[PDB]
Structures are given as C-alpha cells and as structure tokens.
C-alpha cells in the first residue's frame, strides 16, 4: 500500500537540488517509507499539516530528529520546549511567548531597523559584497546577541553551535558525526551563557530568568530555556534573509515591485520563508497506531515531515515555484504549525522586514557577480556565499 523509496533526503546530492526529488516524494503517494533510514515520510502540504496539528499522536517528546529518545540518549539534554509535549510543553512555551511578545517587539524595533539601515549603507560603500557573510550573517549577529544580553567575548561560538544543533536533528551521517565531534567548546560556551549572572539586564535571557518568580518556570528551568534561544533563531533567520536577497537577485521584477511599495517588505520576507524554507524537515514519533492519508503507521515510528516540499506542493499553492511578494502566504509551514509553531517568529519577521525595507529604500539593483555556493546541513537550507553587486538608489 505504501511505496518504499531509496531517496536519501539527507544526502549532499539531495541538498544540492531537492526540488525534483521532492516532487517524486509528493507524487509517489501521501505517505512514503524511506528505506535508507527506516522512517515514514510525508511531503504533501495536507499530510504535513495534519501531522503538525496532532501533537498527541505525533509527539515531539521522543525527539524531533531521526533519533528516538526512547531508544537512544539525546546528544544533549532535551529542550524544555521543542522536545516536550503538552502539558509539560505548555508553561515554558508561555514564558517564551511572553519574552518574545508582540509588545516586546516594540522595545527592539527601532534599534533593529537602525542597524539594518546602517548595514545597507555600509555595503553600498563597498559595492560588491557577499550577501551571506556581509549581510545575511552580519546583520543578525549585529542585533540578536545584544538583544539576548550576551557579553561580547565568545560570540564566535554562536553560529557553530546553531549549525551543530540542526545537524544533530539528522541521521547519524558524516555531517552529524563531524558536528558532534567538534561540539565540546561551543557546548561549553552556550551552557555558561545561560546562567543568570551572564545575561545583561533587559535582554531576552534576563527576562526568561525573571519569569522564575511567577510559578510558570522554576529557577533551575531558566538556563535550559535560555539555551533554546541560543539554539534556534540565528541560522534560520540568516538563511531566511540570504534567501530573500537571493530571490530579489534572481527575480528583479519582484525587487522593482518591492522598491515601488516598501510596505511589502514583511510579506516579501514571508514569501522567502515559504520559497526556500530555511527549516527543511522535522520528525515526529507515533504514540499509537494511526491512519494517515489511507496509510497505517504503527506505534513508535518516526515520521519525517518535508516542510519545504509542503510549501511547494501544487495541490495547495498556485505557481509554487515562483517568488511572488504579494502572495497570500498565510498557511505556509516554514515556521511550523500548531502548538510548536515558531515562538520566535515575531523576532524573525522583524529582522527580515527591516532588512528588506532598508534594501527597498536604498538599493536600485542587486546583481549576482560571482559563483553561488550552497551551505550543507542536515536540517537547514541556505547559501554559503552569494556575491552580489549592489547599485545605490
Ligand atoms: C526565518 C526564521 C525561522 C524559521 C524558518 C524558524 C522555523 C521554526 C520551525 C519550523 C519550528 C517548528 C518546530 C516544530 O514544529 O517541531 C520552530 C520552532 C521554534 N523556534 Fe523558530 N524559526 C525561525 C526563527 C526563530 C527565531 C528568531 C527564534 C527565537 C528568537 C526561534 C525560536 C524557536 C523556538 C524556541 C521554537 C520551539 C517552539 C516550540 O516548540 O513551541 N525561531 N521554528
Ligand atoms: Cl548543548
């Protein structure tokens, strides 16, 4: 009933161009079995959405990577929020919801937008830049560690730690094992920055620790919750911004539209998240036998959701492979869906919006003028290097 496929969704060959293989996964059926890793796969929008919105049946507490925590030790203590199910999930989720709240965005927006405008001004002075290192990476590094309240020393550890976390979701291939091999110093830095004295007042980290007063989290829970914001947030936002620039470079008509109406900045970033889906994949584990799209999956089985494929499923999207900054993007799963939907999505959309706004107001053209190079990660899709020439407006 269920087709078996030999496609390795974590192969370098696959990362180089996933889109043909994703149609193959979508069209083979609503539920596939991937023989290479012994997991079920769902690549159509409808089934991905169904799995995300039934956390009771498709739990996260047994891990959202390939590894099943009922069978193997996690490579690090479990996240109190990503790797938890309701009800244990609920109060740490509420805390991070308040730490990264609609009202909190007001406190940071002016400084985030000023840093984005200043970065664009700086890059226009240079002309030909690397839109990854010099923009997609430089800008979040210039705002988020400060907004966290991190000290300056040691920040070189943040990007290697983030890439490790997302490689560790993958299967035990060389990408993952090389990442854990090099992990000890980055792990040591992050855990130490999670302690309350090392987090500057008014920042996200201090604010998490302040919630230990309310009964929502205990003092001994705060460091692990801070860890969440030093694990998630950087690489996806970097890849999202780099994806936006990439699209604006390859689809100049959309840059011209954005220039003519800079208020499209926020949706242009959201369309970039759907179009490239920085978070490509996530696992769930069945807590029972379940019927999913005509297929029967037993208990304790790993289910791989293809988020990026779901975002390009023609059964849901008109012209899915076109970048359209006026698309009705509501309902894409680039941030997930349901109880675990990205709690930091307001931070990400804010960083993305103000950067695209600065480009929309300050740049006339963005032209690729060098070899484009892809960055390989078990879970993240993004670019290594994007040489562009910026033309001032
Ligand atoms: C373009 C940027 C981003 C993308 C594409 C993205 C993607 C995602 C996705 C797909 C999930 C779902 C996890 C699941 O369903 O198991 C998630 C959850 C999460 N994200 Fe984001 N994220 C982004 C930015 C951020 C930022 C900026 C932060 C923090 C400031 C953050 C923190 C978190 C946390 C803590 C969770 C776990 C939430 C929970 O389990 O309830 N993310 N993210
Ligand atoms: Cl760790």
TrEMBL record:
One MF term in the entry's GO annotations: iron ion binding
Binding site for heme b: 89, 93, 284, 340, 342
Keywords attached to this entry: Heme, Iron, Metal-binding, Monooxygenase, Oxidoreductase
Cofactor dependency: heme
Top-level taxon of origin: Bacteria
Pfam families found in the cross-reference section: p450
Classification via CDD domains: CYP199A2-like (cd11037)
PANTHER family given in the database record: CYTOCHROME P450 YJIB-RELATED, P450, PUTATIVE (EUROFUNG)-RELATED
Family per record: Belongs to the cytochrome P450 family.
Name listed for the protein in its UniProt record: Cytochrome P450
Organism whose genome encodes this protein: Rhodopseudomonas palustris (strain HaA2)
């Amino acid at each position: 009933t269920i087709p078996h496929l030999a496609i390795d969704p974590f192969s370098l060959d696959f990362f180089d161009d996933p889109y043909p293989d994703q149609q193959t996964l979508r069209d083979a059926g609503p539920v596939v079995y991937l023989d290479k890793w012994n997991v079920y796969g769902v690549a159509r929008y409808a089934e991905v959405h169904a799995v995300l919105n039934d956390p009771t049946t498709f739990c996260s507490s047994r891990g959202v990577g390939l590894s099943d925590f009922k069978k193997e030790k996690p490579w690090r203590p479990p996240s109190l929020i990503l790797e938890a199910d309701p009800p244990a999930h609920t109060r740490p989720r509420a805390v991070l919801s308040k730490v990264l709240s609609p009202a909190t965005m007001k406190t940071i927006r002016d400084g985030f937008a000023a840093a984005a405008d200043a970065k664009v001004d700086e890059l226009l002075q240079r002309g030909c830049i690397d839109a990854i290192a010099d923009l997609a990476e430089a800008y979040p590094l210039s705002v988020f560690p400060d907004a966290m309240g991190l000290k300056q020393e040691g920040r070189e550890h943040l990007l290697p730690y983030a890439g490790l976390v997302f490689n560790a979701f993958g299967p035990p291939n060389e990408l993952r094992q090389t990442a854990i091999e090099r992990s000890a110093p980055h792990q040591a830095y992050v855990n130490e920055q999670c302690q309350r004295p090392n987090l500057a007042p008014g920042g996200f980290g201090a604010c998490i620790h302040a919630f230990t007063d309310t009964g929502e989290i205990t003092p001994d829970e705060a460091p692990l919750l801070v860890r969440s914001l030093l694990s998630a947030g950087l690489d996806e936002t970097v890849n999202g911004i780099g994806a936006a620039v990439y699209c604006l470079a390859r689809f100049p008509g959309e840059l011209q539209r954005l220039r003519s109406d800079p208020t499209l900045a926020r949706n242009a970033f959201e369309e970039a998240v759907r179009f490239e889906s920085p978070v490509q994949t996530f696992f769930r584990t069945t807590t029972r036998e379940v019927e999913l799209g005509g297929a029967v999956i037993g208990e304790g089985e790993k289910v791989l959701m293809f988020l990026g494929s779901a975002n390009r499923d023609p059964r849901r999207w008109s012209d899915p492979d076109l970048y359209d900054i006026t698309r009705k993007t509501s309902g894409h799963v680039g941030f997930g869906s349901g109880v675990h939907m990205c709690v930091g999505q307001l931070v990400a959309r804010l960083e993305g919006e103000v950067m695209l706004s600065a480009l929309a107001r300050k740049v006339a053209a963005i032209d690729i003028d060098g070899p484009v190079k892809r960055r390989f990660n078990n879970t993240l899709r993004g670019l290594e290097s994007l040489p562009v020439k910026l033309t001032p407006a």
